[PDB]
Write a protein that binds this ligand. Structure first.
Ligand SMILES: COC(=O)[C@H](Cc1cccc(C(=N)N)c1)NC(=O)CNS(=O)(=O)c1ccc(C)cc1
Ligand SMILES: [Ca+2]
Length: 223
């Protein structure tokens, strides 16, 4: 997260860290047995880390659970990143509490202008490299497709939406991928991609979760 602020220990209870010997992507807890993340974050040997704040110090509220199954979206395209979403099932159900909670799936999509909360342990520098150990937060609005495409020349599909500030300075970044974009209490986005970080006229691109609720619900019911 570039230009954000220290969230505060466990203030984003649904945020998870995907670990394969080190943190490599974020994710969202949607229930006691399932996590949603980005398809390009797929890797084998994933261990889900819940209740985290400082990812380098055991603080006492963490729950480390291995993934028993990973399901990348059937139409995921790594070339354009269309349908960049994936579900991960935990080997054992997580214990829900004040510091480990699930986030609700959307009933309908969100309109441009809506404010959202984006969080992650990604790079905090715009022109350099610096990774935080504590979770960083960032409030940003949903931009209209027209203003996004016009300003960035990005090739965006109906399964993506842009969020951020065209003036740059604030944006998600490397290491934040797979993380949540929560607006009005619902999980509306998954950090997907972008061009550099916090660049002028280059806002972040997110997976439009409202378009996948049926697939998500169906997949968890049958798995
Ligand atoms: C540009 O260089 C990168 O390393 C970015 C970082 C990044 C990741 C997530 C969000 C942001 C952001 N600014 N909000 C930035 N990664 C990527 O963007 C993802 N991998 S990528 O750079 O390989 C890529 C990008 C776009 C397509 C169609 C295909 C592949
Ligand atoms: Ca920790």
């Amino acid at each position: 997260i570039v230009g954000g602020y220290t969230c505060g220990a466990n203030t984003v209870p649904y945020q998870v860290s995907l670990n394969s010997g080190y943190h490599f992507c974020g994710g969202s807890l949607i229930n006691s047995q399932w996590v949603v993340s980005a398809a390009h974050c797929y890797k084998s040997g994933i261990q889900v880390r819940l209740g985290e704040d400082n990812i380098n110090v055991v603080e006492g509220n963490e729950q480390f659970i291995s993934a028993s199954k990973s399901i990348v979206h059937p139409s995921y395209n790594s070339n354009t990143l269309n349908n960049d979403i994936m579900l991960i099932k935990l080997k054992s159900a997580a214990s829900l509490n004040s510091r480990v909670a699930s986030i609700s799936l959307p009933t309908s999509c969100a309109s441009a202008g809506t404010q959202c909360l984006i969080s992650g342990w990604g790079n905090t520098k715009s022109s350099g490299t610096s990774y935080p150990d504590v979770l960083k937060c960032l409030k940003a609005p949903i931009l209209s497709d027209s203003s996004c495409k016009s300003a960035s020349s990005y090739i965006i599909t109906s399964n993506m939406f842009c969020a951020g500030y065209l003036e740059g300075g604030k944006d998600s970044c490397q290491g934040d991928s797979g993380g949540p974009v929560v607006c009005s209490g619902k999980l509306q986005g998954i950090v997907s991609w972008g061009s550099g970080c916090a660049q002028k006229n280059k806002p972040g691109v997110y997976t439009k979760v409202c378009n996948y609720v049926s697939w998500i619900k169906q997949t968890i019911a049958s798995n």
